[PDB]
Write a protein that binds this ligand. Structure first.
Ligand SMILES: O=C(O)[C@H]1O[C@H](O)[C@@H](O)[C@@H](O)[C@@H]1O
Length: 308
């Protein structure tokens, strides 16, 4: 029971997935690298399989500085604590992987890291992600006629609902751990997610029809509570930032390389049917007003123009 005051220091992590998912692997890499790098003693306790809840729970735990010390979070699950951060990977922000990589290779997102630390007391220590989010539905959704009134779950950040509303869908901010039942029960017709998570949590079992809208390439900060990070000795702080940066690089190389491979695994196994969306690129014009308005409201117009 007896730990070092800021014998050993124990850092508690959370993941929604098992050991086979890129986020869990990224967190294990983080732990490995801190151990390699730190001339000192630290113990990591990673609680997997959503034992400690979902991201919407984790973010409040980190803001409070209790329960868990580190995890990975989607920007669009952080909006209640930092209204600007969902800009980081909002729908249709990135053109392709090359664009996404150019961003993560800079420090252009810095203003958003700063807001998260200031407003939410959550420290970004690296960036993983690299999955491509597509529509996943009970029945095929392949035209704008199909999309009109399409009931779908979105993450809670306002920008998510605003985007899909502009595409004429009917979004619903339903908890991630309630999606499978909500589809199975017909409350909604589908949701949207990347390959790795669809496969790992078996969402194809209730929603076997995937539409290649390719509307998000994920940016997934590796995060530590500000309360924990700021308490750590100065040398361990610096190690955590180095390990986080390297773990993020590892995780996003991993997920981005495996995304298409996993779509193919699910097709080959008869689990998914994959279809293109007719006139998909019309989507880009339709969502531009919503993107611009959001950026303007949070005073991030210049940040968005740079990214584009
Ligand atoms: O849609 C979601 O809530 C989740 O989807 C996927 O599991 C991941 O991108 C995760 O970071 C998100 O929180």
């Amino acid at each position: 029971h007896h730990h070092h005051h800021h014998m050993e220091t124990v850092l508690r992590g959370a993941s929604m997935f098992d050991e086979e998912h890129a986020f869990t692997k990224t967190l294990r890499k983080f732990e490995e690298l801190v151990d390699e790098k730190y001339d000192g003693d630290v113990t990591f306790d990673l609680r997997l399989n959503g034992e400690l809840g979902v991201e919407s729970d984790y973010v409040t735990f980190l803001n409070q500085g209790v329960a868990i010390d580190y995890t990975i979070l989607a920007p669009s699950n952080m909006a209640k604590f930092a209204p600007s951060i969902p800009l980081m990977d909002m729908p249709f922000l990135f053109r392709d992987l090359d664009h996404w990589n150019a961003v993560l290779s800079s420090d252009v997102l810095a203003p958003l890291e700063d807001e998260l630390l200031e407003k939410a007391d959550i420290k970004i220590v690296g960036y993983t992600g690299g999955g491509t989010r597509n529509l996943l539905s009970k029945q095929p959704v392949v035209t704008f006629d199909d999309l009109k009134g399409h009931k779908m779950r979105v993450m809670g950040a306002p920008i998510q609902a605003q985007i899909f509303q502009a595409l004429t869908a009917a979004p619903s901010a339903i908890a991630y751990n309630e999606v499978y039942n909500a589809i199975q029960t017909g409350v909604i017709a589908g949701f949207e997610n990347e390959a790795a998570s669809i496969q790992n949590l078996k969402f194809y079992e209730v929603a076997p029809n995937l539409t290649l809208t390719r509307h998000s390439i994920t940016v997934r900060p590796i995060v530590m509570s500000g309360k924990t990070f700021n308490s750590l000795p100065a040398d361990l702080q610096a190690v955590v930032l180095e390990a986080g940066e390297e773990a993020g690089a590892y995780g996003r190389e991993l997920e981005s390389r495996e995304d298409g491979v996993k779509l193919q695994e699910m097709v080959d196994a008869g689990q998914l049917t994959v279809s293109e969306f007719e006139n998909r690129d019309k989507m880009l014009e339709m969502v531009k007003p919503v993107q611009d308005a959001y950026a303007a409201e949070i005073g991030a117009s210049d940040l968005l123009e740079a990214v584009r």
